[PDB]
Amino acid sequence: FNADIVARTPKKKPFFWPEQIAGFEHMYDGNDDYPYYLLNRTDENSGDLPTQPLAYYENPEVPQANAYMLEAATSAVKEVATLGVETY
Amino acid sequence: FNADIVARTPKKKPFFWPEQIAGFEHMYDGNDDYPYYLLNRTDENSGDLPTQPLAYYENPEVPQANAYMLEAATSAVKEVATLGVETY
Amino acid sequence: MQIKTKGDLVRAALRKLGVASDATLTDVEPQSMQDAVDDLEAMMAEWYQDGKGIITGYVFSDDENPPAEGDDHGLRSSAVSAVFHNLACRIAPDYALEATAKIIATAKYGKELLYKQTAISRAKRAPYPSRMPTGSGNSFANLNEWHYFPGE
Amino acid sequence: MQIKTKGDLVRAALRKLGVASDATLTDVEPQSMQDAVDDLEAMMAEWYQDGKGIITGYVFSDDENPPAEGDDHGLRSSAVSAVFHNLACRIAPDYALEATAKIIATAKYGKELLYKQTAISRAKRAPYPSRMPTGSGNSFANLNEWHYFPGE
Amino acid sequence: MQIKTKGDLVRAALRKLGVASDATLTDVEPQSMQDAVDDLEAMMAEWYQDGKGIITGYVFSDDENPPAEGDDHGLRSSAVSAVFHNLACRIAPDYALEATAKIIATAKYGKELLYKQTAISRAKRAPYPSRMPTGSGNSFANLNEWHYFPGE
Amino acid sequence: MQIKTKGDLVRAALRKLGVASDATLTDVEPQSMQDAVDDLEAMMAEWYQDGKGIITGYVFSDDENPPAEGDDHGLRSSAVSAVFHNLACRIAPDYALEATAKIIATAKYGKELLYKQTAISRAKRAPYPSRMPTGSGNSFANLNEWHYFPGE
Numbered sequence: 001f002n003a004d005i006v007a008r009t010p011k012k013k014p015f016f017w018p019e020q021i022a023g024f025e026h027m028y029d030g031n032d033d034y035p036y037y038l039l040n041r042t043d044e045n046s047g048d049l050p051t052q053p054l055a056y057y058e059n060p061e062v063p064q065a066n067a068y069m070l071e072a073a074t075s076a077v078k079e080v081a082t083l084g085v086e087t088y
Numbered sequence: 089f090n091a092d093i094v095a096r097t098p099k100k101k102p103f104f105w106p107e108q109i110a111g112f113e114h115m116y117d118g119n120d121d122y123p124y125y126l127l128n129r130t131d132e133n134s135g136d137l138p139t140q141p142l143a144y145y146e147n148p149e150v151p152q153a154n155a156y157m158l159e160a161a162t163s164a165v166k167e168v169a170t171l172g173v174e175t176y
Numbered sequence: 177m178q179i180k181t182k183g184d185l186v187r188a189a190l191r192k193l194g195v196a197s198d199a200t201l202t203d204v205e206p207q208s209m210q211d212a213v214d215d216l217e218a219m220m221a222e223w224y225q226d227g228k229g230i231i232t233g234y235v236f237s238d239d240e241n242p243p244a245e246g247d248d249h250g251l252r253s254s255a256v257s258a259v260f261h262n263l264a265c266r267i268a269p270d271y272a273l274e275a276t277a278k279i280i281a282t283a284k285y286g287k288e289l290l291y292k293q294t295a296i297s298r299a300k301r302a303p304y305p306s307r308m309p310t311g312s313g314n315s316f317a318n319l320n321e322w323h324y325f326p327g328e
Numbered sequence: 329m330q331i332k333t334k335g336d337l338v339r340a341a342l343r344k345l346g347v348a349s350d351a352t353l354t355d356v357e358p359q360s361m362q363d364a365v366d367d368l369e370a371m372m373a374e375w376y377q378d379g380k381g382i383i384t385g386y387v388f389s390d391d392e393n394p395p396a397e398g399d400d401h402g403l404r405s406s407a408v409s410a411v412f413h414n415l416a417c418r419i420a421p422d423y424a425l426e427a428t429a430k431i432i433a434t435a436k437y438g439k440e441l442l443y444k445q446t447a448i449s450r451a452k453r454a455p456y457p458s459r460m461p462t463g464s465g466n467s468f469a470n471l472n473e474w475h476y477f478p479g480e
Numbered sequence: 481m482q483i484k485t486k487g488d489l490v491r492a493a494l495r496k497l498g499v500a501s502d503a504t505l506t507d508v509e510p511q512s513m514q515d516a517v518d519d520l521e522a523m524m525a526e527w528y529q530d531g532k533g534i535i536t537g538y539v540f541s542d543d544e545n546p547p548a549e550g551d552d553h554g555l556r557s558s559a560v561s562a563v564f565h566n567l568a569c570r571i572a573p574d575y576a577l578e579a580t581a582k583i584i585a586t587a588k589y590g591k592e593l594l595y596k597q598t599a600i601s602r603a604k605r606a607p608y609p610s611r612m613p614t615g616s617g618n619s620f621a622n623l624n625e626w627h628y629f630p631g632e
Numbered sequence: 633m634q635i636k637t638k639g640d641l642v643r644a645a646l647r648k649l650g651v652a653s654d655a656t657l658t659d660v661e662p663q664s665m666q667d668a669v670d671d672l673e674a675m676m677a678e679w680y681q682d683g684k685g686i687i688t689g690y691v692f693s694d695d696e697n698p699p700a701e702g703d704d705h706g707l708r709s710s711a712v713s714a715v716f717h718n719l720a721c722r723i724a725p726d727y728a729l730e731a732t733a734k735i736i737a738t739a740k741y742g743k744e745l746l747y748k749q750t751a752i753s754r755a756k757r758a759p760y761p762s763r764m765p766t767g768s769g770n771s772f773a774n775l776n777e778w779h780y781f782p783g784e
Binding site for chain 2: 064
């Protein structure tokens with residue numbers, strides 16, 4: 001299950017309105033040719049673009065239940081897979 | 089019981105209004121072909137979409153009662169399953 | 177349904193706005209009805225972004241057929257209310273009017289319900305990445321040399 | 329119940345709005361009643377999203393039968409109040425009116441109660457995943473080589 | 481669509497503002513229509529920043545052809561509505577007016593939908609940096625001495 | 633574009649303010665046009681801070697040529713709207729007026745779009761510092777005794 005979390009889960013990337021980065025889309029593709037990132041500010045109908053702190057997709061995380069149960073199952077198999085104390 | 093928590097529990101995914109990601113649904117399916125995620129901003133009736141911080145489904149967690157009771161039961165069986173001190 | 181044509185939707189919207197109805201004594205000029213039909217067609221084209229927007233079954237009239245009013249809209253029964261409520265909201269500014277709050281709320285609710293099923297159908301999970309192993313548990317895949325997922 | 333037809337629902341909605349009643353001296357034109365029935369049918373079609381929405385037992389009239397008013401709605405006893413309150417709220421804008429706060433509150437409460445039982449019935453837990461073992465405690469399944477849950 | 485020329489867009493905007501229509505008794509002077517067409521051309525030039533702005537298929541008329549009104553705009557069916565809505569918001573100050581809230585909301589929504597597809601198409605990930613190795617897993621690249629990504 | 637001269641920009645600004653137009657019955661005195669042209673020249677000089685400000689291609693008239701009105705402004709097609717909207721905003725106080733909210737919003741948006749491309753072009757990363765080594769990986773530079781970056 002945990003492996004499925006690593007592969008099929010969206011990565012951590014910013015959430016953008018299309019109008020926020022209109023015309024600056026080449027600044028966010030991953031290159032390092034610019035000293036900063038530019039954002040559009042004005043709108044011809046709303047006057048100014050609304051203010052909202054940038055939100056990023058959360059990083060994938062292994063649930064506490066998964067880790068706890070994996071550790072518990074491994075410990076159980078370790079404890080039960082002891083023949084005798086030795087195969088006398 | 090803990091195993092039932094691991095398997096039959098919805099995992100951590102964002103909560104979205106259908107209109108927030110209308111037309112951008114292929115951006116959230118899990119691929120890594122985009123530098124960011126785009127969200128719809130405007131509504132033709134409400135003017136602008138309401139602002140609300142993104143909510144994620146909580147990760148599955150083993151309750152403190154379950155872990156405490158598993159440890160207590162294991163300790164009780166460990167202590168009571170001692171013949172004598174030796175089988176004299 | 178009794179609303180089976182584009183003009184029926186236009187009359188329903190006008191009745192919603194109180195501009196005209198089959199009960200009133202003065203009905204709008206047929207040019208106003210043609211303008212409302214044009215507004216409905218433009219709105220439906222805007223919603224249906226060449227198949228990447230809201231799917232409704234609307235049938236777009238052709239230029240060869242003279243009357244735009246009179247052709248069946250092709251909408252399902254559950255879509256008529258949202259369509260004509262949004263049409264009333266859109267054509268209210270023509271008559272120096274403003275649709276009441278109930279009409280706006282109904283239009284929002286109807287558009288959300290219109291896109292609900294399409295949004296459900298479009299919530300598809302992407303396939304496994306091309307660099308992800310299938311695992312030794314998949315005996316059939318591993319015996320046929322399918323160690324990694326195809327992807328795409 | 330004394331409300332057994334679509335027209336009975338329309339009359340109850342009109343009475344709730346104070347527009348027309350069996351006690352007033354001026355009643356609406358039958359065309360207004362037909363328009364209200366059309367609005368009721370559109371609202372019911374919107375609610376009943378081809379079986380994936382609010383289930384109420386409402387019977388949709390067919391085009392072959394001439395009078396849409398006169399057929400039994402088929403609603404339950406507990407659904408009539410919500411239906412006609414929502415209908416009054418929806419048809420208020422026709423007469424340049426706005427339903428009072430009590431009518432809107434009753435409509436909200438009635439719609440919630442309408443969907444309550446269906447929401448209870450639709451809260452079904454998904455089966456065990458296909459990769460989840462049954463466990464050795466399930467002796468019957470383990471003896472019959474059912475070491476893993478089927479899934480789907 | 482019935483809106484096939486720039487003048488059709490201008491008339492739609494004027495009808496939206498309530499300034500003039502085919503139903504009213506007084507229409508604007510043709511000079512007003514020419515001014516509106518000039519405003520539409522300026523707005524389209526501003527949006528289409530020489531190919532780096534909003535792509536819509538709009539065709540810019542030349543000075544050689546005398547009548548600017550009469551040439552097809554070249555817009556797609558889904559792009560028309562937004563256009564004239566925005567046009568209304570840009571020509572309301574000429575007649576000492578102010579477009580109502582619905583027109584402004586529709587203009588915002590239409591512009592967003594206009595740029596949605598171009599924004600999707602422009603969300604391209606940059607290639608690997610020139611200093612990033614390909615890895616030994618890429619047997620084909622490693623055998624052909626392609627140990628590092630090209631870049632650019 | 634039909635706006636090809638400074639006077640065309642002034643006339644567009646005056647039309648946007650509702651002060652004068654080719655449709656009105658009273659047009660401003662030519663001295664008012666000259667004053668508006670002077671304001672436009674001052675605003676363009678302020679924007680174009682001797683090449684360190686907003687680059688637009690505007691051509692500044694010389695004192696030798698008598699008529700300041702009549703010369704082509706030299707602006708691009710995408711710059712005309714922003715220029716004349718800002719001009720209308722700037723010359724509104726002359727006639728005891730105040731530009732409406734839409735005009736100010738359009739002026740802000742147009743100025744932002746005007747400076748967008750120049751801002752993109754001016755986001756240049758500084759070279760490596762003079763004290764930064766090139767590294768042994770750069771075999772060509774190391775063999776030619778270029779152990780450190782030049783700088784400046």
